[PDB]
Design a binder for this molecule. Structure first.
Ligand SMILES: CC(C)(C)c1nc(-c2c(NC(=O)C3=C(C(=O)O)CCC3)sc3c2CCCC3)no1
Length: 127
Protein backbone atom coordinates (compact mmCIF):
# COMPACT_ATOMS: atom_id res chain seq x y z
CA UNK A 1 0.00 0.00 0.00
CA UNK A 2 1.33 3.42 -0.97
CA UNK A 3 1.26 6.72 0.96
CA UNK A 4 1.87 8.76 -2.18
CA UNK A 5 -0.49 11.68 -2.58
CA UNK A 6 -1.48 15.23 -1.80
CA UNK A 7 -3.39 15.69 1.46
CA UNK A 8 -5.41 18.60 2.78
CA UNK A 9 -5.81 19.08 6.51
CA UNK A 10 -9.43 18.48 7.56
CA UNK A 11 -9.12 19.02 11.29
CA UNK A 12 -6.63 19.01 14.15
CA UNK A 13 -6.65 18.76 17.91
CA UNK A 14 -4.24 20.48 20.32
CA UNK A 15 -2.25 22.53 17.81
CA UNK A 16 -1.80 25.37 20.30
CA UNK A 17 -0.94 23.22 23.30
CA UNK A 18 1.62 21.26 21.26
CA UNK A 19 3.20 24.33 19.66
CA UNK A 20 3.47 25.99 23.10
CA UNK A 21 5.10 22.89 24.55
CA UNK A 22 7.86 22.92 21.95
CA UNK A 23 8.58 26.61 22.41
CA UNK A 24 6.98 28.25 19.41
CA UNK A 25 6.61 32.04 19.68
CA UNK A 26 2.97 32.83 20.47
CA UNK A 27 2.96 34.96 17.35
CA UNK A 28 3.55 31.92 15.06
CA UNK A 29 0.96 29.94 16.95
CA UNK A 30 -1.94 32.34 16.37
CA UNK A 31 -0.97 32.91 12.76
CA UNK A 32 -0.74 29.20 12.02
CA UNK A 33 -3.44 27.53 14.17
CA UNK A 34 -6.17 27.86 11.53
CA UNK A 35 -4.19 27.19 8.37
CA UNK A 36 -5.50 24.16 6.48
CA UNK A 37 -2.79 23.53 3.93
CA UNK A 38 -1.67 20.71 1.69
CA UNK A 39 0.95 18.14 2.58
CA UNK A 40 2.61 16.01 -0.09
CA UNK A 41 4.04 12.49 0.19
CA UNK A 42 6.08 10.88 -2.53
CA UNK A 43 6.72 7.21 -1.80
CA UNK A 44 9.22 5.03 -3.67
CA UNK A 45 9.34 1.65 -1.94
CA UNK A 46 11.13 2.30 1.33
CA UNK A 47 12.09 5.84 0.30
CA UNK A 48 9.77 8.72 1.30
CA UNK A 49 9.81 12.41 0.48
CA UNK A 50 7.62 14.68 2.64
CA UNK A 51 6.66 18.26 1.90
CA UNK A 52 4.56 19.19 4.92
CA UNK A 53 2.54 22.32 5.70
CA UNK A 54 2.63 22.75 9.48
CA UNK A 55 0.99 25.99 10.52
CA UNK A 56 2.77 28.76 8.66
CA UNK A 57 5.86 26.64 8.01
CA UNK A 58 6.76 24.24 5.22
CA UNK A 59 8.74 21.25 6.47
CA UNK A 60 10.78 18.98 4.23
CA UNK A 61 11.87 15.42 5.03
CA UNK A 62 13.45 12.68 2.93
CA UNK A 63 14.28 9.25 4.32
CA UNK A 64 14.40 5.54 3.75
CA UNK A 65 12.56 3.50 6.39
CA UNK A 66 14.96 1.63 8.66
CA UNK A 67 17.88 3.90 7.80
CA UNK A 68 19.16 6.78 9.90
CA UNK A 69 17.84 10.14 8.72
CA UNK A 70 17.41 13.76 9.76
CA UNK A 71 13.93 15.09 10.49
CA UNK A 72 13.20 18.79 10.41
CA UNK A 73 11.55 20.29 13.44
CA UNK A 74 9.19 23.29 13.74
CA UNK A 75 12.03 25.31 15.20
CA UNK A 76 14.23 24.70 12.11
CA UNK A 77 16.53 22.21 13.87
CA UNK A 78 17.55 18.81 12.39
CA UNK A 79 17.35 15.67 14.55
CA UNK A 80 18.92 12.26 13.91
CA UNK A 81 16.47 9.37 14.12
CA UNK A 82 14.92 6.45 12.24
CA UNK A 83 11.46 5.99 10.76
CA UNK A 84 9.90 2.54 10.71
CA UNK A 85 7.02 0.88 8.92
CA UNK A 86 4.55 -0.96 11.19
CA UNK A 87 2.21 -2.92 8.99
CA UNK A 88 1.71 -1.51 5.51
CA UNK A 89 0.00 1.67 6.61
CA UNK A 90 1.82 3.06 9.65
CA UNK A 91 4.97 5.18 9.84
CA UNK A 92 6.35 5.40 13.37
CA UNK A 93 9.22 7.46 14.79
CA UNK A 94 10.55 9.44 17.77
CA UNK A 95 12.49 12.67 18.05
CA UNK A 96 12.98 15.21 20.84
CA UNK A 97 10.68 13.12 23.13
CA UNK A 98 7.92 13.18 20.54
CA UNK A 99 6.26 9.92 19.55
CA UNK A 100 4.79 10.21 16.08
CA UNK A 101 2.51 7.78 14.34
CA UNK A 102 1.32 8.48 10.80
CA UNK A 103 -1.37 6.13 9.62
CA UNK A 104 -3.12 5.85 6.25
CA UNK A 105 -6.64 4.44 5.89
CA UNK A 106 -7.94 4.74 2.36
CA UNK A 107 -7.88 8.48 1.67
CA UNK A 108 -7.49 9.59 5.29
CA UNK A 109 -4.14 10.12 6.96
CA UNK A 110 -4.10 10.37 10.74
CA UNK A 111 -0.97 11.99 12.11
CA UNK A 112 -0.65 11.61 15.87
CA UNK A 113 2.22 13.24 17.75
CA UNK A 114 2.58 12.73 21.50
CA UNK A 115 4.69 14.96 23.76
CA UNK A 116 4.25 14.43 27.47
CA UNK A 117 0.48 14.25 27.95
CA UNK A 118 -0.30 16.32 24.87
CA UNK A 119 -1.79 14.41 21.96
CA UNK A 120 -1.47 16.52 18.83
CA UNK A 121 -3.69 14.85 16.19
CA UNK A 122 -4.08 15.90 12.55
CA UNK A 123 -6.49 14.42 10.05
CA UNK A 124 -5.94 14.97 6.32
CA UNK A 125 -7.76 13.77 3.21
CA UNK A 126 -6.34 12.95 -0.21
CA UNK A 127 -7.22 15.48 -2.94
C1 LIG B 1 5.40 11.59 8.98
C2 LIG B 1 6.85 12.02 9.32
C3 LIG B 1 7.69 11.97 8.13
C4 LIG B 1 7.41 11.15 10.36
C5 LIG B 1 6.83 13.43 9.85
N1 LIG B 1 5.73 14.21 10.06
C6 LIG B 1 6.16 15.42 10.51
C7 LIG B 1 5.23 16.54 10.93
C8 LIG B 1 3.81 16.71 10.53
N2 LIG B 1 3.17 15.85 9.51
C9 LIG B 1 1.89 16.05 9.00
O1 LIG B 1 1.17 16.91 9.41
C10 LIG B 1 1.55 15.08 7.94
C11 LIG B 1 0.36 15.10 7.21
C12 LIG B 1 -0.68 16.08 7.48
O2 LIG B 1 -0.55 17.33 7.01
O3 LIG B 1 -1.68 15.74 8.20
C13 LIG B 1 0.26 14.03 6.22
C14 LIG B 1 1.68 13.28 6.34
C15 LIG B 1 2.46 14.01 7.52
S1 LIG B 1 3.20 17.97 11.29
C16 LIG B 1 4.36 18.52 12.19
C17 LIG B 1 5.60 17.65 11.99
C18 LIG B 1 6.91 17.97 12.80
C19 LIG B 1 6.90 19.13 13.66
C20 LIG B 1 5.63 19.63 14.13
C21 LIG B 1 4.50 19.67 13.20
N3 LIG B 1 7.51 15.38 10.64
O4 LIG B 1 7.92 14.14 10.20
Amino acid sequence: MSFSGKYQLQSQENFEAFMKAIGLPEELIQKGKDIKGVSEIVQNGKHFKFTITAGSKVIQNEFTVGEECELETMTGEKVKTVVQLEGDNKLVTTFKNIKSVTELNGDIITNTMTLGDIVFKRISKRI
